[PDB]
Structures are given as structure tokens and as C-alpha cells.
Amino acid sequence: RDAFFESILEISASELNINIQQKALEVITKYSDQIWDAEEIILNDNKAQLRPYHKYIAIIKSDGDSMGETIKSMGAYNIPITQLSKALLSFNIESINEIVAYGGKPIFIGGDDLLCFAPVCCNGNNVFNLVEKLSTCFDQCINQHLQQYINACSEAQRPLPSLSFGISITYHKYPMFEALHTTD
């Protein structure tokens, strides 16, 4: 209710325009194992257009780099932290928008982290394309809101705040606990 997508395979092959949730529910009609198996064999006999990247799952984890250091650097130049809050919130909203646009799934947070469950390739768009768009969105929000900090601390020299990225691509099997720890 306060929110408004499961298994591991449905968002690995969200490109065929095929609704595995509906057919899996029809077949099954405790829960997770049976529907997991149903989705598995449904896209097993969807072999006609199934490429090897349709069975691989990409986990994307990102965190903000030196946020406290950026805060301390803005403190020297008399720059409010409200601008940083603005940039982070706008980046998070745009991140959710473009992650659902790409074909993946946002899971974790709209803070300075992001854990996304995305297919390797949907509509000819990579997970690396998704990472590039996320980085560009974060840079755009930083520049748009911290413009004062941008043209005040970057002329002489400084690295601007950025986000480091962690991507893990594994089979739909090979459970996602180990994959999550590998991503971490």
C-alpha cells in the first residue's frame, strides 16, 4: 500500500514482450519455488527467440564517493547543504525513472545508494548503457544544482562528487545471495 516483480528470471528476459507472471499464475492456480519452476520451464519452451543473455541477471550497486569530503569542501566556499540534498533527490527520482524505463527493477533506496536488478540487454540497451545513463544523470543533477560549487571549486583543481558502480552478471540460477555478496 505504501509502495504502489519476483523470482530472478522475469527481469532477465523482459524483452520478448511476454507476460510470464500471468501464465505462471495460471499454471500454479509454498509459492516462490513453484512459480520459480513455472517461469523457468515457460521460458524454457520459449526457446524460439531466447538468447543466452536472456537467462543472465545483472545486479547493480552504486554508492556516492566522498560525500562528507564534498560537504567539507562546500563548507569552505560558503555553500549550503540544501543544494546537495536537491541534487541527490533529483538524481534518485531520475534513477528510478530511467531504471524502470530501461527494463530493470529498482529495489533498495533513493538515498546515495542504488541496488538494481536489471536484464543484461533489453531493446538493444546494455546494462553498461544503464550504468552510463545513471552516471550521466548523477553528473547532470550535481552540475544543475551544485552549479555554484561547480564553477567555484573545479577551476583551480578538485575532483567533483561521483558514484562508484558495482555490477555482477550471473546465471539466473546460482542463487542471488552469493551474487549480492559478490556485488557488495
Ligand X SMILES: Nc1ncnc2c1ncn2[C@@H]1O[C@H](COP(=O)(O)OP(=O)(O)OP(=O)(O)O)[C@@H](O)[C@H]1O
State the nearest-atom distance from the C-beta of 64 to ligand X, in Å.
5
Query: Is there binding between residue 88 and ligand X (CB under 6 A)?
Result: yes
Query: Is there binding between residue 109 and ligand X (CB under 6 A)?
Result: no
Spatial separation of the C-alpha atoms in residues 76 and 62, rounded to whole Å:
27
Binding-site residue total for ligand X (CB under 6 A)?
12
Spatial separation of the C-alpha atoms in residues 128 and 114, rounded to whole Å:
15
Q: Write out the binding residues for ligand X, residues 136-165 only, by CB under 6 A.
A: none
Give the HSE-up count for residue 100: Cα atoms under 13 Å, Cβ half-sphere. 8
State the nearest-atom distance from the C-beta of 171 to RNA, in Å.
6
Q: For the chain, what is the radius of gyration of the CA atoms?
A: 20
Residue the block writes with cell 536472456: 54
- Compare residues 25 and 109 and give the one whose CB is closer to ligand X: 109
Strand partners, 56: 171
* Residues that bind ligand X in the complex, under the rule CB under 6 A: 63-68, 81, 84-85, 88, 111-112
